Structures are given as C-alpha cells and as structure tokens.
Design a protein around this ligand. Structure first.
Ligand SMILES: C[C@@H](O)CN1CCN(CC(=O)O)CCN(CC(=O)O)CCN(CC(=O)O)CC1
Ligand SMILES: C[C@@H](O)CN1CCN(CC(=O)O)CCN(CC(=O)O)CCN(CC(=O)O)CC1
Ligand SMILES: [Gd]
Ligand code: NA
Length: 128
C-alpha cells in the first residue's frame, strides 16, 4: 500500500507515535517519506547482506527475521514480511523499540540528513 500524507499521519497518531519519546508527529511522517516514499512494500539491500523492510525501512540485522541474514537478531519477534503489510501496526510497534534504544531517531539515516533541524510540522500541515 502507498499511503497519502494525512492518511499516514492519522494512522501513526492512532497508534501513539505523536510525541513518542519527544518526537512530534511531523518527524515520523518526514522519515517515512524519505525512507520508503510512503510505500509499505519497499525493500533495499545493504552491503553487509542485511535488508531494510517496509514504510520505516527496518533492518534485518537486528529487528526481524528474513532467513538470509546469518548471525542476525530478531528483537521485534516478527518475520520481516510482516513489515510489508498494508496494516502498519507491526512497523509502528517495532519502531517504538528502535527509537527507545538510546540513539533516538538518528537510527534513520534519511531522518538525520533530511528531517532533523527543519520545520517538521509542515509535514502534517493541512491534515484533519
Ligand atoms: C537495544 C538495542 O541496542 C539493540 N541493538 C541490537 C542488539 N545488540 C546487543 C545489545 O544491544 O545488547 C547490538 C550490539 N551493537 C552495539 C552494542 O550494543 O554494544 C549494535 C548497536 N545498536 C544500537 C545501540 O546499541 O545503541 C543495535 C541494536
Ligand atoms: C557490549 C557493550 O554494549 C558494553 N556496554 C556496557 C554495558 N552496558 C549493558 C550491556 O551492554 O549489556 C551498557 C548499557 N548501555 C546500552 C545498553 O546496553 O542498553 C550503554 C551503551 N554502550 C554501548 C551500547 O550498548 O551501545 C556501553 C558499552
Ligand atoms: Gd545494541
Ligand atoms: Na535508535
């Protein structure tokens, strides 16, 4: 599924991402745009053999099981394919664990380089 901007904002709010660990809703919508272009089915391979999955590009090295990242962990206790669903519940719940690990939203490279230090409220402007 490819989300609309306000559609995604509303879904993220309902699942409790707004102000989670002090990150306002606009931060999360910005992150999703540049990580996946709002597409739940996005995947990208990394150089070490791991793969990033879903709307927030969660990495198989630590967070989910894809059966082809030998020596990896599965800290969200899910198959990586669960992160590609039209229902974003699994992605949101796993992202909550990631952002809580000590590095905050710096775990998302696109957020650090394209969202951090900007007017992030602009990403939810106009939404009901
Ligand atoms: C809770 C997260 O920390 C999970 N973590 C995966 C689990 N392991 C071991 C462990 O963290 O117990 C990773 C080891 N490693 C360095 C280290 O931790 O010393 C990578 C660091 N990151 C994040 C960070 O450490 O801030 C990856 C996410
Ligand atoms: C193996 C290293 O990870 C050692 N580690 C010291 C041991 N403890 C607890 C533990 O790591 O089991 C530290 C707790 N803490 C984060 C956390 O662990 O959750 C501090 C961060 N760093 C590294 C990192 O975790 O990224 C400190 C180095
Ligand atoms: Gd760690
Ligand atoms: Na983090």
């Amino acid at each position: 599924k490819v989300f609309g901007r306000c559609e995604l904002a509303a879904a993220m709010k309902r699942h409790g991402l707004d102000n989670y660990r002090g990150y306002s809703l606009g931060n999360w919508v910005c992150a999703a745009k540049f990580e996946s272009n709002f597409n739940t089915q996005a995947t990208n391979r990394n150089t070490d053999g791991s793969t990033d999955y879903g709307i927030l590009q969660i990495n198989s090295r630590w967070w989910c099981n894809d059966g082809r990242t030998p020596g990896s962990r599965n800290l969200c206790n899910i198959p990586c394919s669960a992160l590609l669903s039209s229902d974003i519940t699994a992605s949101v719940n796993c992202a909550k664990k990631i952002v809580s690990d000590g590095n905050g939203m710096n775990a998302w490279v696109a957020w650090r380089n394209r969202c951090k230090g900007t007017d992030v409220q602009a990403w939810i402007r106009g939404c009901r």
